[PDB]
Write a protein that binds this ligand. Structure first.
Ligand code: NAD
Ligand code: NAD
Lengths: 370, 370
């Protein structure tokens, strides 16, 4: 069987010959009970770069050992791409949200042999699920693999926006000191109201990390948390996003991209936020209206915006989130720390092993069971 | 009387004409139950810029109402400085650590009428206490006023170093995407070993904030915490700094600058840290050897360094911490967020009220009772 695997380019300096550190911590479980991925073996050392083309998610020796072929490419856009040229033949397709090979209805129809689509990461919005179901295709993602990584990025970005980190760092680089320049927009996070859209794996991890900062916590989720959890964290549940954002100094978005979240943060909802609110979005780019964010930063309605997720990806050179005032953006990286890569790579293998050995794929990994 | 108050320059764009936020959270007390400052009145809105020359720590109306004179400058360096000029006559000297008017033994000899030296902030290492004790000069600082502010800065810097935030932001500004270049040095903090030098007001606030990141916590303090506290936070006590840093992925320094700590992180101590350790220092610059830090970052012994404190202050344009690799520096800003300034400015006025009304200055503010 042919496995077709789309990954991002190596670093422009070459695939790394060494790393800043010798190893990474062992993670073998997640809050709430779920175990870390359980492949029978891994053919990499946690901490290696796995998610770029030379890394191959550590899959080659395993797949070739079983008589399969593995095609790895970053070339994923259009009919002429290696991806589309190889797609009709592939039984299995794998990519990461950070560099996603879209399975549109058109691509799915062309993909005559496709039985399994794996998301190495979380969030399968790049796969047409209606089309997968129609064609009996199984769709899996590595649930929880990077949720914590994101939660860390979120808290980092909230503190960086509120405290005015990056502007202050720039004064250092520019050879200045300029205390008042740095702190005329520098606040403490303490005792601010912070709210999350969603309290799933990421959102709950964010709340737990925010708690000791002594903020007042708020959230909305279609699935309300147990009352006892609300009480332990000091959470206020709100019946809607709109109702929540009205009282928040800071809002972080941690819901998947789907009908109810597409363009959720448009001019109208942003206008309901407190003037000078901070908005953080490591969920998906399209949950926030591109130009509405820009307008709100320009007017001061938002004091700052930060996230790692864009529409489209990669963001073109002219993408206006690059030059809008008061941002702390990164490219789409939070879910692809080297730490996270070890887990979703192990998880991708665990899924492939279940597939080939005809064992059930873990229930929490399954998005459609074909 | 004459009050001589050294503050930092206004922003280059002048005293702020507006702010990003309408207000700041009300903070009436600190963890453990010390009250927030208790002046009879304040003449500012919390959230206003107070620590620059036009801000005046909001003291003018009050001091002039009592018939006193208030002289505010940023000109603090040498014998031909406004500070030194004005010093012979001043009954009270006020300055902040962010832009410190150093009270050396010569300047104190010169300071014929000086009876009260107030640190608007925390940490009086710019004041020679023995020369001050000699002259029955009172030395006071606004204990706890910005402790929490620093702790937030620390967690922000730890996350930014470990996850590789600033170089990733720069790819955004430069028009790139470059996922692998971002993440080839990007780790999660989760389950790393983190140690603090000191668990006082800052150190303990750091530990509490790091706890739900699910790191393994370590500390040294000259005064060991209660067992119940170490148990609750899961802390490993070490009998020295050297003993702790050998097992830490991240070290944060939160001790005052004194003989115990001057030049503590030298070539030797740093050589005992893990290869690729991260070091954060928002305490005082001199606690780390300037050139040692540079060498360690150049060799990769440290994967990163971040902090807001320097020697001297301001740092010259050629100070090597500006250009050394893998840093996340700011100028000395963490204890002077707008939120902190509201508290230390209030505390400054509280102190002055006590002095003028011949009431005792709260004991927790007193460094020397003269
Ligand atoms: N690198 C990255 O930036 C990165 C990595 C992983 C995940 N993500 C994104 O974050 C999303 C969340 O991941 P997770 O691990 O928390 O998933 P999860 O499934 O554990 O949690 C998602 C939560 O969103 C809630 N939800 C759905 N629609 C909502 C709405 N309209 N309002 C409020 N809550 C709503 C669900 O009830 C659920 O609790 C993923 O779908 C993905 O899009 C980003
Ligand atoms: N803007 C800033 O970056 C900023 C702001 C305020 C404070 N500071 C610095 O932080 C220092 C600590 O502030 P704090 O509010 O926590 O004060 P604190 O007095 O509550 O805490 C100091 C702690 O350090 C401990 N200590 C002293 N010598 C030590 C040593 N050699 N090893 C380990 N622990 C040692 C003490 O026992 C105490 O627990 C201040 O003295 C100041 O230099 C920096």
């Amino acid at each position: 069987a042919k496995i077709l695997c789309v990954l991002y380019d190596d670093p422009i300096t070459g695939y790394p010959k060494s790393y800043a550190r010798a190893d990474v911590p062992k993670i073998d479980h997640y809050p709430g009970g779920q175990t870390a991925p359980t492949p029978k073996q891994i053919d990499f050392t946690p901490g290696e770069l796995l998610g770029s083309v030379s890394g191959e998610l550590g899959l080659r020796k395993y797949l070739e050992g079983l008589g399969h072929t593995l095609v790895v490419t970053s070339d994923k856009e259009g009919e002429d791409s290696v991806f589309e040229r190889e797609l009709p033949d592939a039984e299995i397709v794998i990519s990461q949200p950070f560099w996603p090979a879209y399975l549109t209805p058109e691509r799915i129809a062309k993909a005559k042999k496709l039985k399994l689509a794996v998301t190495a990461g979380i969030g399968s919005d790049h796969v047409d699920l209606e089309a997968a179901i129609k064609n009996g295709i199984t769709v899996a993602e590595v649930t929880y693999s990077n949720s914590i990584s994101v939660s860390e990025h979120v808290v980092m970005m909230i503190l960086s926006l509120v405290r005015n980190y990056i502007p202050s760092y720039q004064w250092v680089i520019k050879g200045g000191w300029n205390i008042a320049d740095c702190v005329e927009r520098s606040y403490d996070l303490e005792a601010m109201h912070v709210g999350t859209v969603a309290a799933g794996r990421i959102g709950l991890a964010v709340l737990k990390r925010l708690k000791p900062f002594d903020v007042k916590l708020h959230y909305f989720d279609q699935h309300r948390l147990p009352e006892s959890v609300e009480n332990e964290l000091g959470l206020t549940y709100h019946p809607s996003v709109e109702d929540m954002v009205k009282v928040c100094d800071v809002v972080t978005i941690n819901a998947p991209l789907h009908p109810g979240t597409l363009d959720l943060f448009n001019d109208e909802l942003i206008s309901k936020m407190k003037r000078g609110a901070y908005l953080v979005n490591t969920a998906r780019g399209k949950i926030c209206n591109r130009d509405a964010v820009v307008r709100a930063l320009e007017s001061g309605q938002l004091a700052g915006y930060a996230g790692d997720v864009w529409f489209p990806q990669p963001a073109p050179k002219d993408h206006p989130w690059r030059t809008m005032p008061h941002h702390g953006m990164t490219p789409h990286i939070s879910g692809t720390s080297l730490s996270a890569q070890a887990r979703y790579a192990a998880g991708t293998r665990e899924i492939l092993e279940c597939w080939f050995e005809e064992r059930p794929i873990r229930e929490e990994y399954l998005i459609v069971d074909g």
